[PDB]
Amino acid sequence: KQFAVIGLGRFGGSIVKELHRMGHEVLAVDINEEKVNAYASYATHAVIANATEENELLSLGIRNFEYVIVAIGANIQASTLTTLLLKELDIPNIWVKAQNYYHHKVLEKIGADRIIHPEKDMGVKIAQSLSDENKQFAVIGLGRFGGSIVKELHRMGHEVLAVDINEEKVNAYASYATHAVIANATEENELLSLGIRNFEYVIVAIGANIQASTLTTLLLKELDIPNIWVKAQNYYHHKVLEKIGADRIIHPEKDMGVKIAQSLSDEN
Amino acid sequence: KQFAVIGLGRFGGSIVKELHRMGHEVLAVDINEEKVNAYASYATHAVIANATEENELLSLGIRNFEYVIVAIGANIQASTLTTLLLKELDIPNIWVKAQNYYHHKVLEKIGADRIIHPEKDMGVKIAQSLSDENKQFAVIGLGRFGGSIVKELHRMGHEVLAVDINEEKVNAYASYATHAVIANATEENELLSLGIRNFEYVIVAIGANIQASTLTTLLLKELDIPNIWVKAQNYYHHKVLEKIGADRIIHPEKDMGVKIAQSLSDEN
Amino acid sequence: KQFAVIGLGRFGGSIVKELHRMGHEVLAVDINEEKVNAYASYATHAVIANATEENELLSLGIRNFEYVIVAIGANIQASTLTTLLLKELDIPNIWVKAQNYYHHKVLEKIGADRIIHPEKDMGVKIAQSLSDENKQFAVIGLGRFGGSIVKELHRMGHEVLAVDINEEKVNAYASYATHAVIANATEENELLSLGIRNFEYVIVAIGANIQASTLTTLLLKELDIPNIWVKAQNYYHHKVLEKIGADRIIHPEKDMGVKIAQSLSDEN
Amino acid sequence: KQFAVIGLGRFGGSIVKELHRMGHEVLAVDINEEKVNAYASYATHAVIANATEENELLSLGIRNFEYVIVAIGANIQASTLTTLLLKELDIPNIWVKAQNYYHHKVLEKIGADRIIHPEKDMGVKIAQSLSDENKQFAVIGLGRFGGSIVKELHRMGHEVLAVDINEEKVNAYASYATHAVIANATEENELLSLGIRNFEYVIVAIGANIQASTLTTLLLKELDIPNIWVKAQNYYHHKVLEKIGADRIIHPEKDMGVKIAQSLSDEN
Amino acid sequence: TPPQVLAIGFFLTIIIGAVLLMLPISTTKPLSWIDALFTAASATTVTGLAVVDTGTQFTVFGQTVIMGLIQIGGLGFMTFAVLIVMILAAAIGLKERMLVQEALNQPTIGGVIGLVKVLFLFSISIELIAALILSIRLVPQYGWSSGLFASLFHAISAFNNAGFSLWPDNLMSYVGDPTVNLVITFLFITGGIGFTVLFDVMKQRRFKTFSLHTALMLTGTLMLNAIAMLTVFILEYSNPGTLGHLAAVDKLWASYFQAVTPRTAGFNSLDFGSMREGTIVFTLLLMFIGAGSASTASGIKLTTFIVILTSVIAYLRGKKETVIFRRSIKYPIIIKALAVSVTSLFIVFLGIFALTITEQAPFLQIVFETFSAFGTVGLTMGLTPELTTAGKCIIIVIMFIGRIGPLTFVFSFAATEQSNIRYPDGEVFTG
Amino acid sequence: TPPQVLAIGFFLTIIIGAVLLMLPISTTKPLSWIDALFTAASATTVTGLAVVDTGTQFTVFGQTVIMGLIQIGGLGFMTFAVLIVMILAAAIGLKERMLVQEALNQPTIGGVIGLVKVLFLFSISIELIAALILSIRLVPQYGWSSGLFASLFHAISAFNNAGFSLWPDNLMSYVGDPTVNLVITFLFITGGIGFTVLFDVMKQRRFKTFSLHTALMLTGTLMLNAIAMLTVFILEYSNPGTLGHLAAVDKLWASYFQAVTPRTAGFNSLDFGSMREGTIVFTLLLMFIGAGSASTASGIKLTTFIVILTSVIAYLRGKKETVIFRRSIKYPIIIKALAVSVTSLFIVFLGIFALTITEQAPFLQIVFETFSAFGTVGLTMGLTPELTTAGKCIIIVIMFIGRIGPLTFVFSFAATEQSNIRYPDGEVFTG
Ligand SMILES: [K+]
Ligand SMILES: [K+]
């Protein structure tokens, strides 16, 4: 019944927006006000505060909330200390957004009732969408997301043509995919020589350099790729990728929040 | 009759390709071979050499060519020294691609029979295409190209809403346009507040950062801008900008070469 | 009696070296082997292992050690998770090297029997050395170290001419020093205009850019500054600063380890 | 009798300062005023102007000067166009500072009565100082300067242990020195293994990264190297290198100007 | 909203109160419709002017309702609106926290509800102990029916910088009274200095640990007063009318008080209608510049002056920046200072202009009246009683605009416009 | 140096000239040592004040030497020092080019020698053709001994904005003279607008291609005059003393001229000693703000006003920057404007203060005299002749400081200090 999300990042913001949509009270709150302002009408209560300060957690009657969500990215200590303080107020169910592997472990020994990996957990879901969607699978960009799909699909037992720009990643994924390949998705001859045309499902998970994500999907749409799924970064990336011909765009942080906002709702 | 183009850059390449099309002998030649290879069937004679070396100019019977074209970009000294050597062989008409203003002057005292500014000279032509095309004119990005259009259109006597990201340029163009504005074409409120919607002809000349060129045209197409003309950088930029809704795309270097390839042809 | 130091950084290395000197058993151990190698004869037992793995902590009979030292810098999670695992093996007294403020808090709720701030805790000691050393005090570079001296000296009740390159820090130290000044120690006129010549004790705590630390001390020695104390980074910094005329050089990480290696010794 | 130096760079500044010292009229002049200001009492006439503009050359009665010096570095076109304009006013003897090889050629076809390579021409002089100074020769850093010494000394017939950080240069100097070696002067084992201790004359010509120049000389002085000659960059580099034990410091740009200021004086 | 609320809101306390006194109970002689909406506005603005006398015209009902109006604005309009929600209810969100941040000049909103208790409570604190105790020391003369009241009525007016005196002789009767000059001055002085300097010196209490602002006030405050006592004493020394013939000690109680009362105090130790022309001048400027920010009334707070002036003192030299007490002053403070500066003047000028024609009165008095009117100074060269009707409505606006501050007042009916696009440089000379 | 030179230099033309007229040849009646170093300083400053009448007291020698002094400063002090090195010699380095860049308000030094010829030559150009031709049209009445001179003497004073009239009735005799009001107004108006707007409109001549500054002047200049003629006409309409009884057409020649003469013109179409108090007021402000930068005289040039005011108008709204004619105004122009603004006031106040005690005169006249004195306006409520000695020395400094501009004047004895080190933020309220 009592919902409160700390940290209005892309993830923490996609939960205060979804829960409010469904019609559930959401005590949104972030460190600064820049975000807290845009979410003044996206939550039951928009508050500007720092989750590391005790008096701020108390004064906000945060103790009445059975479901606390620590979505503060970056500064891991911010994510930790918060969950740490939360577990002290005997918060029933604390859900936290971990960054790396160790964040998972540490947050697990603190008392985190649940940890979510936006990039990771999403890939597995997509790896489930591509499977129930039909044969030829290929994922470009072995980032955290693109890596969680080559790992999941291979698990299920589906051919996955994994491939990233450098080899550092392609090496660790030599036995995590049907075919590990080191190449650059922007070069034509490399896309052709890789018989990428035989793949009905192409996944552009290359983060950072948006142009890399775009140009790739651009080249892909030229080879008449049946269904191209791409990982967009910001809003505009969505638009541009949509006019290119992207058969599907995924927002790891965004799309995940809505799912959690559904897990916290059906949880009571 | 005798045609020879030095430097197979984007410009020097659009001339060896065009002249060969018309059916005129073209002694294409660049410093390295990377380009000279792709132009083996795009010119009467593909040669790999350095225009600064004497023996290489002589051995290539370059003296028999009445029309020499120095399109070697970058290293200005390469462009200069070449024209310098050329003028020594009493080359009838030497046409050279100047980079900056001073390049114009120096190349003029050397004996350059003709100097071309791909970016500059092209803008004036477009400024002529937009004029004979019909009222509301606005050019985004005051680069060399975008600056040669706000200067020409204002000359003709047409309203030009000049505007660039910073102010450094917008300042020098305060009396070169109906309205000099300092703004960023990626921000919505800035496009709206500038009543950019009343302009039937928008010109995105922002070079470098392609995304800047794209996103802008993207926003423009949203305001239902009648005719949006954009300056593309590379091939892919052409494609992507074409799927966005760009009413027209211009390649300063490319489109200019074809025109010159027409000036050298009708010149004899 | 049982001593073991995890993480052979500059700090963790200055403790395994000092304790072994005194004649105390030291179970040195770092993640990689690069360091563990050079410390094969600097500790009772040099071991290559990762403090986050359980089986590695157990197999190393780490449970028999009453004094565990987590000096692993950088990756805070490494520092945390370790102390976390340590507190599970009921380690009597766990001493950990915290990085930032929050690291202090979190490490405090885990069970850290002691936390040390190499940069911070050292400054206070020096602020005690400069006080018992005699009037005019001035500290350049408000880093973590240079900031812990302007704060301590002002506490005792001594004039402190705090001053850093930018203003970001100089602002937070407006009421933490007799005089907060924003300036660059490399410029002469700025050193003069600040009457820095009247200061018998100058402290160059500017980290990072060694040249900044050097050139400053260099300029300082020219104004015939009585006693110039400088914060050296690496070994060579020590040498070069020594030939310049540095009246005193301090290694926050190094010099602190020896002190702790003295606290652990006299502690039993 | 009539002396005028254009471009107050490090070189052009060491000539207006030296000639004025001797007691000769010097029409100092640079593009901006920043330099022209500090040289108001270092020349018969300090003028702020641009050598590319005609009216500025005329209005400055530059035609009355028999000796014009174009020391404007960087923008080669500035160095060229100037000499170009100068040769038009029938300037008796125009001396210009060339940057690279091609600058030499082009400036030679313009009419440059003399071209000087500060870095190059200086090395040959030093290569003459080290020769008449006495057996074991070794030059570190194959920059333009360090390269003009390994080339000159080998010419005379003296053993030269050439050596630079990378191999790119060390390759072209395989037959330009008694022993071409690829190494980093900051590493000890590399200095020892190269029997550098047997060399009575070590030359640190590594430009850029001053620390490289310093640390090296620092290590050198430790091996008790008889006479260490180092290439300093700025003023402070001089001081610091002087307190390290540098048996000699050379300022390619500076020391050369004084020599030229001696050539122009004895030239009439 | 924060601005408007203090605009139209403070406007009602004047109207409502303009009838709370125009009532047959508080008025002996007929109170014309004009001389009623005035005197009621002067007290609420803590200005010090009145068409009709005080202690006389008004009964014990018209003298008590004046203390209530002189208190309302004595701390601001929102300083009493957030105190009626904590002693009767409790708990207040970030919706009302943005209102008292505009009635006491505060750059912070996240914490202005809890203070509400302290301010008013602390108000009636130093107001009682310094009035009914230290001011009833030498005033019990008139008995208890006029000694108990007259000693409590002037404190709520003294500490609040009001200028509303009971007896017709606006304190003019106590020329050299040691208790008066000492007791009342301490009231409007401190009560005059921004609440900051008030609160600051309290918990800080350190001779050095005083913030730029607080540290400023004390210096400028005292320092200036010295230049004030020196001026009044040098010009009104031989003046046979006032001070000129007073003894040796009584001459200091006049120069001092008269050099401290222009600080929007409103008390007369002598008479301004009989002093060297020069003196009156220095005053127009001495009353123009109020005293303190959070203060308790003023047209252009002392701080503004210092900044504007000193900031210019730096220009004439070279300092690329305006640095005070080795704690430089950011750029913003400059522009705002200028704004608040030119505004007060631009307006006061509009008044001096819209009055010289409205009523046939001298010029010196027409200018002295305006400056004092916009700065709620209280000192009147004897033109307040003889103010026509036409010149009243407008004058009522002056005091209204002056007390409400030219800035926080203009933000109300000012459609805030946000420019997102920059423009080309605009060269222009002014030397 | 650039500043000092114009400071102590312009100071000598006043002294040397104060003896060029005190000579028995140019003075009929004895010219006291006091009323000699004054009238000679008023003409050189082109101020419009004089202890002794003009056309009378002075002979043909005391009326010719006045036109020479009214010309010297009519273009600046360094506008005549670089004109004696090109017509007699030629060639000038970058050493003297930095002096005329401070006497005509120029942000450039690399080119102020060549112009020297044009300025003065162009001066005596419009001064002759508009005086001996258009001003000798309706003045040949007094014959050739007084019709030829009287028509040339007023132009060197009209175009230069001087206020020095021949006949005792400072043009007051020509109330509705079409030639006078039309001829002389065009002289001090244009001569008044900065040399820029003068030179600009010349080669530019385009209705749009006028730089920010130039474009400004024209608008503000004319626009303001409209508010000026409207003011003087509405207040002095029924005034039986002046204009009030003039016909229908003669009422416009008074309102117009009187609304254009305060621009440091110095001519009287009527009498300021007999006009509604309100009118005189608007004037103090209308004469405070001069007219144009490069102009020919003024205390605080029009431009400064616009900026300061408008800049504030932007604050009350929101525009993060002060943008004019869609050509934003850089930050610097703001601070300097403020400086020049507060300076003129701070000083004029020091005068109005140091005069009310020096001489027993009315207050309205003591303030009108000061503003006019610092802005070399020429209009005097009839107190100039009755100026005591004590109030003269100081008054001579006013006109001196005003004409020399408060900025370029303060840079002389101002030890320029350069701060290289920054300091911590300094919070301070002022609302
Ligand atoms: K008052
Ligand atoms: K005048």
Numbering used by the authors:
A (entry chain C), B (entry chain G), C (entry chain A), D (entry chain E): 7 to 140, 149 to 282
E (entry chain I), F (entry chain J): 15 to 445
From the paper:
We study the molecular properties of the membrane protein KtrAB—a member of the Trk/Ktr/HKT superfamily of transport proteins that shuffle K+ and Na+ ions across the plasma membrane, closely resemble K+ channels, and underlie environmental adaptation of cells of plants, fungi, bacteria, and archaea. KtrAB is formed by the KtrB membrane protein and the KtrA cytosolic ring protein. KtrB is responsible for ion permeation; each KtrB subunit has the architecture of a potassium channel pore domain, consisting of four M1-P-M2 (transmembrane helix 1-pore helix and loop- transmembrane helix 2) structural repeats (D1 to D4), which embrace an ion-permeable pore. KtrA binds to both ADP and ATP, resulting in a low-activity ADP-bound state and a high-activity ATP-bound state, respectively.
